[PDB]
Amino acid sequence: PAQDNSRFVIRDRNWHPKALTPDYKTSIARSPRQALVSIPQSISETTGPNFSHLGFGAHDHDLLLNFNNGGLPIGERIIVAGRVVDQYGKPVPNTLVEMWQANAGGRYRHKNDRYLAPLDPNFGGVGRCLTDSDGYYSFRTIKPGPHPWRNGPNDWRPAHIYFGISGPSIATKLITQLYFEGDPLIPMCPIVKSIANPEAVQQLIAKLDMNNANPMDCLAYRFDIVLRGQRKTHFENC
Amino acid sequence: PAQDNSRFVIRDRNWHPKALTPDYKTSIARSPRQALVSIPQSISETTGPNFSHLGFGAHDHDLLLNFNNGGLPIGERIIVAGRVVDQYGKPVPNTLVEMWQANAGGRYRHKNDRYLAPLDPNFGGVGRCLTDSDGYYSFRTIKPGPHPWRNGPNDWRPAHIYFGISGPSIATKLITQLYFEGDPLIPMCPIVKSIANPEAVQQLIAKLDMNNANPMDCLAYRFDIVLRGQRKTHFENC
Amino acid sequence: PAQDNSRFVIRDRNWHPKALTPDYKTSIARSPRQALVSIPQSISETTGPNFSHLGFGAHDHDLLLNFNNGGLPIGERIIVAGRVVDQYGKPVPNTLVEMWQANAGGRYRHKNDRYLAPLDPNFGGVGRCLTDSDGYYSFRTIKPGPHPWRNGPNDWRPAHIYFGISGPSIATKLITQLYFEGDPLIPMCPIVKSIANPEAVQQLIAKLDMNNANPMDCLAYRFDIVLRGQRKTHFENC
Amino acid sequence: PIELLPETPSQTAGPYVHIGLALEAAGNPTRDQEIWNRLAKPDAPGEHILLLGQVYDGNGHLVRDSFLEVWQADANGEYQDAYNLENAFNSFGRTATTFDAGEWTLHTVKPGVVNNAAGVPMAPHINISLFARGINIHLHTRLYFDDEAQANAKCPVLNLIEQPQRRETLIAKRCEVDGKTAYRFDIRIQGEGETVFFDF
Amino acid sequence: PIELLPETPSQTAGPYVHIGLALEAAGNPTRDQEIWNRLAKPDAPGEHILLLGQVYDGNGHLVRDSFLEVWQADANGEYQDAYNLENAFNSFGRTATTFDAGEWTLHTVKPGVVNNAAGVPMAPHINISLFARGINIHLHTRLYFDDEAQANAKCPVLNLIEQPQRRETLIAKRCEVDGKTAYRFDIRIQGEGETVFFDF
Amino acid sequence: PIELLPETPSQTAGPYVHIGLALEAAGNPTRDQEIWNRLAKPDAPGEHILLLGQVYDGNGHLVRDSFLEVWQADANGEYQDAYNLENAFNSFGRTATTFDAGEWTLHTVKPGVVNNAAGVPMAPHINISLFARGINIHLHTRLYFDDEAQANAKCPVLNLIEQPQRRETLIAKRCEVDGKTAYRFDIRIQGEGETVFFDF
Amino acid sequence: PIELLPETPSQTAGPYVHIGLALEAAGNPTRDQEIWNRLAKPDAPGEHILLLGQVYDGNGHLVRDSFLEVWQADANGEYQDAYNLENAFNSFGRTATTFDAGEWTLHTVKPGVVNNAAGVPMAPHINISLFARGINIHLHTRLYFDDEAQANAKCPVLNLIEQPQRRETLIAKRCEVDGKTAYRFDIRIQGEGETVFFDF
Ligand SMILES: [Fe+3]
Ligand SMILES: [Fe+3]
Ligand SMILES: [Fe+3]
Ligand SMILES: [Fe+3]
């Protein structure tokens, strides 16, 4: 079974977005009004699932092939790759990285999305993988299109891919969104701007990575992820 | 008795901390949601107690001697001294200055403080004096230690001494906290940061004062206090 | 036995303090007036003791428990931790780190210290450990207080902990003093100022390390130590 | 414009305020002379009354660690500023909520009427300043009396509160404690029935 | 001070979280292996229980797009981190509220007692992380059980909640659903009866 | 040019060095194992000798608070680096001046000859590092023996000292203490008869 | 930290100091009242004594242009600050060494014992400040008396001089000059027998 043998650096909740960010209108009614209650780390918080033996399908990381209905999806072929490390710079190997996104036109394969841009019959928009023994992950996909949403009267999300990362414990688990280098929608988005610190916003912007591209084939973007620093316990209960 | 013969410069409530400063968690439920109601100064507000006839014990200003249970307290021997003036620079003489603090390890002599750092059998942590005829006050004490508190999961107050100053009226009365020059905890503290303006925060930082030290004995810190400016009434009721 | 198989980068004796620094008065009569004589490295200088087989007590690194006379010492509970590396950045594992200090009030447990600040019956002021296999060391202690000394008429040492580090040879062995981030006494001290280069002084200032703190318990400071670079011999005797 | 020296900024009095300002309550030994909650000797002129109250946060929960300073005219409408434990009456006092029950008490006399700066009579009132953990700058309020309805209706300070409903939050309720005349003044810092707080 | 690499900042999981993390709930085809809401197979030791609940916003309206992750000890009080669909028990699961099914469910066993880091027993609990549109960083809470009153009263984590009334928000209500033992645990994100959320 | 990480700068060991490094001398309790001044058990191979000396400042006054570390080959010319209180011989030790008389002592064996890096034999020597209040970076020296005159005259390290007169400062004087073979090595930090100090 | 106005920096009094401060010694006309070397008129109580001395530089050569100021208690141990040429005793005086007269003199009484700030008696002493060409800031010293050995051994100021040999530099030697009691006090600014100089 899992053991309590590590502690995780406390989150900076002014680096993350706060709960109440009213320009993102849905946050107004979905933010707690009472303060969070701080509790000490116990085995409940410092452990979590390890997915080394989850069974992955051959194409689970390849969105060009994992919704194949007779053709390739339309849109900008890209590799999205990166490393997961903790705040001490230590790689996070064999960790679960899940991602999902709209198609090249900003349309999601969900019944609730009625945006007029069409679905792509060969694109589903869902990926997963484990990081390797050195902390690296890789997906192949179509660059998602921006899409409009019912916030302000003319609001458009920048192109984005959602990411979920498990890490070593439930204390490290994170959902975030990847944006793309240069996108002029980034500075305008009230969801991006839920993050108060502009330096923190920059951490979510994937960089064009020509070094990792396949010539005559696909481009590549690099998105590195930093989870809470993990340290051994010291001088406790004495 | 007291008479109404002066007016006090209106407070700048953007220089003071605002009531609602949610990173200081207890302020969320203890801040009014309605606006303060402005009222004109009358004799009720422009008068207040004077403590010239309060009887002070010999050691009331000397925390090294006022909780003597067989020895001296452990910790950094310091004089804390300064001048109380109003905003026009006028000294405020014969005014009550009270102070209280934790011991060298950040433990308070209060039944509600269960921090594991020990009490000091020769330290109580409370002082009082009057300013002299030129507005100066002086205490002798131990430099308090920082101490953890149940706000965020790893929050620590900088070393601090609480001050209360009466001044000429109930309109001038103030409670504040003194911090110490260079303490790296100051920029991190959500109570310090309840003050929005960095220049106001600087006003709470006592400076090392080698000129006032007793060689081979104790160091000294200087903390000057500025109360609301007092002026005569003019052109009223005409 | 030991063998001569490495060379150590020559010391920069303008980065270190010089011998004669007259504002530190005792250095005037305890500094050589003749130049040091340079000698080449031999097995006598490039070897030294290793302490892997020295027996350490359970609390040798823990000054909160190693002088226990019925309670805890009074003062600011802190971890002091860091890494010992050489100038090429290589960790120095299994090396002896010794430290000693005054108590919270600047009083040393030494028969020759008659400063009027009291001794703490539960504080001794001495620690030792070995660095681990990755070069890291850790102590738990009380933050020492500044203390006056008979140099100029009103001289005060900043809060400081003495360190001794063995390293791989007698050529690497060092004694130094750790100071604490922000202490306003640092720029004023003639012993600190024995070091001519301000950048070298910065190398002795331990930084507050909230990431390593135990919430509701103790703070932490980080002090990394750099010993002379070690290289293999090359092209000798040919 | 003309900018004077800035005032020293306020900070919270913190959860351990009572060790500097309410020593009995901290669980600590007192000094020979303490500033506390008995404003009137038995020989003081006027109607001797008990004041008491509880303090509530925005969730309706008791604030058990609050500290209050009061300032009031004597029964003859005079502010007695020369503070002295030997005085028949002190216009100034201090109190704090008990930690178990949260209730503060003050022993005093009903204040006489004083005029505002324009010469208009104010209804009998106690000036209160509230301090506590979570309160970054103290809150000013006034305690008026429910058996002074005629004077209250004409008070130039109460009439600066735009809404009659909010004026009601400052009116203490006559009651009896141990058979003796008392007035209860509860303070609600936030939310339903929020007490009026002043700036001046 | 020592400043480490900053953590990647959180963002909302958004309205379409189920397409990535709750494929069946999204009404989309599933892969061969999915992480879902059945922590216990019938053969798992312990008391088999159904958990269910609804999630409400600050206006008291149902949240029909939430995503929940849970982490709990087995019946013996051990956390099982080796996630495998072949296991009779996994400590980790996922569930969701959707337009068609506004009430999430989990099929599990009652967790055994786990000590905190100081060796003090915590009352039986399930750790929950809540994600949704409008939630910028996920909310952490704990589900405790109303039939563990004695343990709940002594739990060092529940006792860090200053107000007893707020502790009640974390206590799930035992019932029966289709003749099997169940507990209902509703979450109120904001306002009246607001659920306690943790930071650690 | 290539600039490596700078070395941590030295500071004085201070007047209270003995509390960290010479606990007996500080007047303090010792730990189970201490690194001190008896390098050789009685069974150690070689000629057992006492070393002793006093340390003088530039005014000719005793340095009463000095701390010395020594490093020497065993009698067979081997450096024993695996420090252990159970060893017959340790190549490393520590000593300190007594505060009343100022005299340090070491119990050891006469070191055997070792070669320099060019393969040339060095005369028998003890490497010494001197620390004290007033000494900002420790002083390195060597103790050689006056009954090794032939070897001393050919030592490639002694011959790096330009002046014969200065070479004499490193030659310890054979004597007898309690009837036992000893060598006295006084150090003069500054001025007349200043001891040679090395850099390497 | 708190930084006050800086003190005006010292400079040497220069080769012609006597024209400003020692007019007779400069061989120049004097004014009606001069501050000079006769602290005691014949009628002053106490033991009348002559003090004399020479001043030497670091090469052992006479300083023939020095200027000295002295401050001492009267025979009762009281400092008399009301300087007046009519007084039988003044606590302050001036003297000099010149080309014609290389040995300064003072005519005074032996000072009584004065306590330090902790109430501990200091041995009888004269405070001296020495100025000259080549001296950038004046040198402070004290003249004590060789016939006060018991008091000197207990003086809290002499005992702050770490080395007993240096304490001897402050002890003036009793003699007789023209049949009257005298003490010789030579000052050596630098080198062999260097006089102790103070900072306060
Ligand atoms: Fe505090
Ligand atoms: Fe989206
Ligand atoms: Fe020291
Ligand atoms: Fe000139």
Side-chain angles (χ1 to χ4, degrees), chain F residues 40-61:
Chain F
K41 280 193 193 183
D43 289 359
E47 185 187 3
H48 289 244
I49 63 176
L50 178 71
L51 302 170
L52 75 177
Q54 286 168 298
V55 180
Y56 296 91
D57 68 22
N59 299 319
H61 298 134

PDB file of all heavy atoms in Angstrom, chain F residues 40-61:
ATOM      1  N   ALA F  40      47.600   8.155  18.351  1.00  0.00           N
ATOM      2  CA  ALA F  40      48.076   6.759  18.403  1.00  0.00           C
ATOM      3  C   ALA F  40      47.653   6.047  19.667  1.00  0.00           C
ATOM      4  O   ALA F  40      47.823   6.584  20.754  1.00  0.00           O
ATOM      5  CB  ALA F  40      49.601   6.720  18.275  1.00  0.00           C
ATOM      6  N   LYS F  41      47.100   4.842  19.500  1.00  0.00           N
ATOM      7  CA  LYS F  41      46.928   3.868  20.588  1.00  0.00           C
ATOM      8  C   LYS F  41      48.333   3.408  20.982  1.00  0.00           C
ATOM      9  O   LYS F  41      49.255   3.532  20.192  1.00  0.00           O
ATOM     10  CB  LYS F  41      46.164   2.634  20.088  1.00  0.00           C
ATOM     11  CG  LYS F  41      44.647   2.750  19.973  1.00  0.00           C
ATOM     12  CD  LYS F  41      44.074   1.338  19.793  1.00  0.00           C
ATOM     13  CE  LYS F  41      42.629   1.333  19.353  1.00  0.00           C
ATOM     14  NZ  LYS F  41      42.097  -0.060  19.263  1.00  0.00           N
ATOM     15  N   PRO F  42      48.505   2.845  22.194  1.00  0.00           N
ATOM     16  CA  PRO F  42      49.859   2.286  22.527  1.00  0.00           C
ATOM     17  C   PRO F  42      50.413   1.200  21.583  1.00  0.00           C
ATOM     18  O   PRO F  42      51.631   1.060  21.461  1.00  0.00           O
ATOM     19  CB  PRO F  42      49.663   1.703  23.928  1.00  0.00           C
ATOM     20  CG  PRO F  42      48.517   2.415  24.485  1.00  0.00           C
ATOM     21  CD  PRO F  42      47.586   2.796  23.343  1.00  0.00           C
ATOM     22  N   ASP F  43      49.531   0.467  20.906  1.00  0.00           N
ATOM     23  CA  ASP F  43      49.944  -0.589  19.971  1.00  0.00           C
ATOM     24  C   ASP F  43      50.287  -0.101  18.568  1.00  0.00           C
ATOM     25  O   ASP F  43      50.701  -0.895  17.715  1.00  0.00           O
ATOM     26  CB  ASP F  43      48.870  -1.677  19.870  1.00  0.00           C
ATOM     27  CG  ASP F  43      48.785  -2.521  21.110  1.00  0.00           C
ATOM     28  OD1 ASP F  43      49.577  -2.268  22.048  1.00  0.00           O
ATOM     29  OD2 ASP F  43      47.921  -3.426  21.145  1.00  0.00           O
ATOM     30  N   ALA F  44      50.138   1.203  18.311  1.00  0.00           N
ATOM     31  CA  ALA F  44      50.424   1.718  16.990  1.00  0.00           C
ATOM     32  C   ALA F  44      51.903   1.481  16.665  1.00  0.00           C
ATOM     33  O   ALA F  44      52.769   1.667  17.539  1.00  0.00           O
ATOM     34  CB  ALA F  44      50.078   3.208  16.884  1.00  0.00           C
ATOM     35  N   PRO F  45      52.203   1.087  15.417  1.00  0.00           N
ATOM     36  CA  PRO F  45      53.601   0.938  15.015  1.00  0.00           C
ATOM     37  C   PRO F  45      54.347   2.264  15.100  1.00  0.00           C
ATOM     38  O   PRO F  45      53.723   3.340  14.956  1.00  0.00           O
ATOM     39  CB  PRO F  45      53.527   0.488  13.546  1.00  0.00           C
ATOM     40  CG  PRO F  45      52.106   0.146  13.281  1.00  0.00           C
ATOM     41  CD  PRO F  45      51.249   0.726  14.345  1.00  0.00           C
ATOM     42  N   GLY F  46      55.653   2.182  15.358  1.00  0.00           N
ATOM     43  CA  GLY F  46      56.522   3.356  15.295  1.00  0.00           C
ATOM     44  C   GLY F  46      56.975   3.903  16.632  1.00  0.00           C
ATOM     45  O   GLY F  46      56.711   3.312  17.687  1.00  0.00           O
ATOM     46  N   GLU F  47      57.654   5.047  16.559  1.00  0.00           N
ATOM     47  CA  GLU F  47      58.207   5.713  17.710  1.00  0.00           C
ATOM     48  C   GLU F  47      57.196   6.685  18.307  1.00  0.00           C
ATOM     49  O   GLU F  47      56.850   7.695  17.683  1.00  0.00           O
ATOM     50  CB  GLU F  47      59.470   6.463  17.313  1.00  0.00           C
ATOM     51  CG  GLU F  47      60.152   7.086  18.530  1.00  0.00           C
ATOM     52  CD  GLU F  47      61.314   7.989  18.168  1.00  0.00           C
ATOM     53  OE1 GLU F  47      61.588   8.203  16.949  1.00  0.00           O
ATOM     54  OE2 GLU F  47      61.962   8.475  19.125  1.00  0.00           O
ATOM     55  N   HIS F  48      56.716   6.380  19.505  1.00  0.00           N
ATOM     56  CA  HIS F  48      55.711   7.200  20.153  1.00  0.00           C
ATOM     57  C   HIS F  48      56.314   8.472  20.717  1.00  0.00           C
ATOM     58  O   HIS F  48      57.329   8.429  21.436  1.00  0.00           O
ATOM     59  CB  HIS F  48      54.990   6.392  21.214  1.00  0.00           C
ATOM     60  CG  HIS F  48      54.093   5.348  20.629  1.00  0.00           C
ATOM     61  ND1 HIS F  48      52.722   5.365  20.797  1.00  0.00           N
ATOM     62  CD2 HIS F  48      54.365   4.293  19.824  1.00  0.00           C
ATOM     63  CE1 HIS F  48      52.196   4.347  20.134  1.00  0.00           C
ATOM     64  NE2 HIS F  48      53.168   3.688  19.533  1.00  0.00           N
ATOM     65  N   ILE F  49      55.716   9.612  20.353  1.00  0.00           N
ATOM     66  CA  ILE F  49      56.252  10.915  20.735  1.00  0.00           C
ATOM     67  C   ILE F  49      55.142  11.847  21.176  1.00  0.00           C
ATOM     68  O   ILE F  49      53.978  11.682  20.782  1.00  0.00           O
ATOM     69  CB  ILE F  49      57.017  11.568  19.569  1.00  0.00           C
ATOM     70  CG1 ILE F  49      56.063  11.839  18.378  1.00  0.00           C
ATOM     71  CG2 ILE F  49      58.228  10.691  19.138  1.00  0.00           C
ATOM     72  CD1 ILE F  49      56.742  12.559  17.237  1.00  0.00           C
ATOM     73  N   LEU F  50      55.524  12.808  22.024  1.00  0.00           N
ATOM     74  CA  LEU F  50      54.674  13.899  22.431  1.00  0.00           C
ATOM     75  C   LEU F  50      55.085  15.111  21.630  1.00  0.00           C
ATOM     76  O   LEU F  50      56.281  15.400  21.477  1.00  0.00           O
ATOM     77  CB  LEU F  50      54.860  14.176  23.934  1.00  0.00           C
ATOM     78  CG  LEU F  50      54.035  15.353  24.453  1.00  0.00           C
ATOM     79  CD1 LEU F  50      52.553  14.975  24.495  1.00  0.00           C
ATOM     80  CD2 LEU F  50      54.506  15.875  25.812  1.00  0.00           C
ATOM     81  N   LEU F  51      54.100  15.812  21.083  1.00  0.00           N
ATOM     82  CA  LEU F  51      54.364  17.127  20.491  1.00  0.00           C
ATOM     83  C   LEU F  51      53.696  18.162  21.382  1.00  0.00           C
ATOM     84  O   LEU F  51      52.607  17.951  21.913  1.00  0.00           O
ATOM     85  CB  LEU F  51      53.786  17.200  19.080  1.00  0.00           C
ATOM     86  CG  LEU F  51      54.304  16.142  18.107  1.00  0.00           C
ATOM     87  CD1 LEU F  51      53.449  16.191  16.840  1.00  0.00           C
ATOM     88  CD2 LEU F  51      55.781  16.373  17.800  1.00  0.00           C
ATOM     89  N   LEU F  52      54.355  19.296  21.553  1.00  0.00           N
ATOM     90  CA  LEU F  52      53.745  20.390  22.332  1.00  0.00           C
ATOM     91  C   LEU F  52      54.282  21.732  21.866  1.00  0.00           C
ATOM     92  O   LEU F  52      55.343  21.805  21.253  1.00  0.00           O
ATOM     93  CB  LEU F  52      53.931  20.195  23.841  1.00  0.00           C
ATOM     94  CG  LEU F  52      55.293  20.463  24.478  1.00  0.00           C
ATOM     95  CD1 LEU F  52      55.144  20.248  25.986  1.00  0.00           C
ATOM     96  CD2 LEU F  52      56.417  19.599  23.910  1.00  0.00           C
ATOM     97  N   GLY F  53      53.521  22.786  22.138  1.00  0.00           N
ATOM     98  CA  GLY F  53      53.975  24.122  21.726  1.00  0.00           C
ATOM     99  C   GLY F  53      53.098  25.218  22.264  1.00  0.00           C
ATOM    100  O   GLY F  53      52.004  24.985  22.813  1.00  0.00           O
ATOM    101  N   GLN F  54      53.608  26.434  22.125  1.00  0.00           N
ATOM    102  CA  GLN F  54      52.855  27.639  22.447  1.00  0.00           C
ATOM    103  C   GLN F  54      52.796  28.509  21.214  1.00  0.00           C
ATOM    104  O   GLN F  54      53.594  28.329  20.284  1.00  0.00           O
ATOM    105  CB  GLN F  54      53.533  28.365  23.610  1.00  0.00           C
ATOM    106  CG  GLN F  54      53.289  27.609  24.940  1.00  0.00           C
ATOM    107  CD  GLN F  54      54.162  28.115  26.066  1.00  0.00           C
ATOM    108  OE1 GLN F  54      55.396  28.046  25.999  1.00  0.00           O
ATOM    109  NE2 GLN F  54      53.532  28.616  27.109  1.00  0.00           N
ATOM    110  N   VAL F  55      51.798  29.394  21.188  1.00  0.00           N
ATOM    111  CA  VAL F  55      51.536  30.207  19.988  1.00  0.00           C
ATOM    112  C   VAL F  55      51.619  31.661  20.431  1.00  0.00           C
ATOM    113  O   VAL F  55      51.012  32.028  21.436  1.00  0.00           O
ATOM    114  CB  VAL F  55      50.135  29.901  19.380  1.00  0.00           C
ATOM    115  CG1 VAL F  55      49.877  30.775  18.127  1.00  0.00           C
ATOM    116  CG2 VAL F  55      49.966  28.402  19.046  1.00  0.00           C
ATOM    117  N   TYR F  56      52.366  32.465  19.668  1.00  0.00           N
ATOM    118  CA  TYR F  56      52.629  33.874  20.061  1.00  0.00           C
ATOM    119  C   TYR F  56      52.137  34.844  19.000  1.00  0.00           C
ATOM    120  O   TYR F  56      52.262  34.579  17.810  1.00  0.00           O
ATOM    121  CB  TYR F  56      54.134  34.086  20.291  1.00  0.00           C
ATOM    122  CG  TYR F  56      54.672  33.261  21.445  1.00  0.00           C
ATOM    123  CD1 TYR F  56      55.179  31.990  21.226  1.00  0.00           C
ATOM    124  CD2 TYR F  56      54.620  33.754  22.751  1.00  0.00           C
ATOM    125  CE1 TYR F  56      55.680  31.219  22.302  1.00  0.00           C
ATOM    126  CE2 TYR F  56      55.101  33.002  23.816  1.00  0.00           C
ATOM    127  CZ  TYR F  56      55.625  31.748  23.572  1.00  0.00           C
ATOM    128  OH  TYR F  56      56.091  30.999  24.631  1.00  0.00           O
ATOM    129  N   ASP F  57      51.581  35.965  19.456  1.00  0.00           N
ATOM    130  CA  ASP F  57      51.211  37.051  18.548  1.00  0.00           C
ATOM    131  C   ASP F  57      52.392  37.986  18.287  1.00  0.00           C
ATOM    132  O   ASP F  57      53.522  37.754  18.728  1.00  0.00           O
ATOM    133  CB  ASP F  57      49.971  37.820  19.065  1.00  0.00           C
ATOM    134  CG  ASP F  57      50.218  38.631  20.344  1.00  0.00           C
ATOM    135  OD1 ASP F  57      51.379  38.978  20.652  1.00  0.00           O
ATOM    136  OD2 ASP F  57      49.211  38.914  21.041  1.00  0.00           O
ATOM    137  N   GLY F  58      52.110  39.053  17.551  1.00  0.00           N
ATOM    138  CA  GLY F  58      53.160  39.931  17.082  1.00  0.00           C
ATOM    139  C   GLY F  58      53.774  40.767  18.180  1.00  0.00           C
ATOM    140  O   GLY F  58      54.799  41.391  17.960  1.00  0.00           O
ATOM    141  N   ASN F  59      53.143  40.789  19.345  1.00  0.00           N
ATOM    142  CA  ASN F  59      53.685  41.470  20.510  1.00  0.00           C
ATOM    143  C   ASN F  59      54.438  40.530  21.447  1.00  0.00           C
ATOM    144  O   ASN F  59      54.860  40.941  22.530  1.00  0.00           O
ATOM    145  CB  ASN F  59      52.568  42.200  21.260  1.00  0.00           C
ATOM    146  CG  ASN F  59      51.905  43.245  20.408  1.00  0.00           C
ATOM    147  OD1 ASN F  59      52.587  43.965  19.660  1.00  0.00           O
ATOM    148  ND2 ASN F  59      50.576  43.305  20.457  1.00  0.00           N
ATOM    149  N   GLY F  60      54.563  39.263  21.054  1.00  0.00           N
ATOM    150  CA  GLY F  60      55.243  38.282  21.890  1.00  0.00           C
ATOM    151  C   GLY F  60      54.365  37.709  22.988  1.00  0.00           C
ATOM    152  O   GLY F  60      54.884  37.060  23.930  1.00  0.00           O
ATOM    153  N   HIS F  61      53.050  37.919  22.881  1.00  0.00           N
ATOM    154  CA  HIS F  61      52.110  37.446  23.898  1.00  0.00           C
ATOM    155  C   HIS F  61      51.454  36.148  23.474  1.00  0.00           C
ATOM    156  O   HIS F  61      51.187  35.930  22.290  1.00  0.00           O
ATOM    157  CB  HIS F  61      51.050  38.528  24.199  1.00  0.00           C
ATOM    158  CG  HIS F  61      51.663  39.775  24.753  1.00  0.00           C
ATOM    159  ND1 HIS F  61      51.331  41.033  24.302  1.00  0.00           N
ATOM    160  CD2 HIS F  61      52.661  39.946  25.653  1.00  0.00           C
ATOM    161  CE1 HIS F  61      52.070  41.932  24.931  1.00  0.00           C
ATOM    162  NE2 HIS F  61      52.876  41.299  25.764  1.00  0.00           N
TER     163      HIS F  61
END
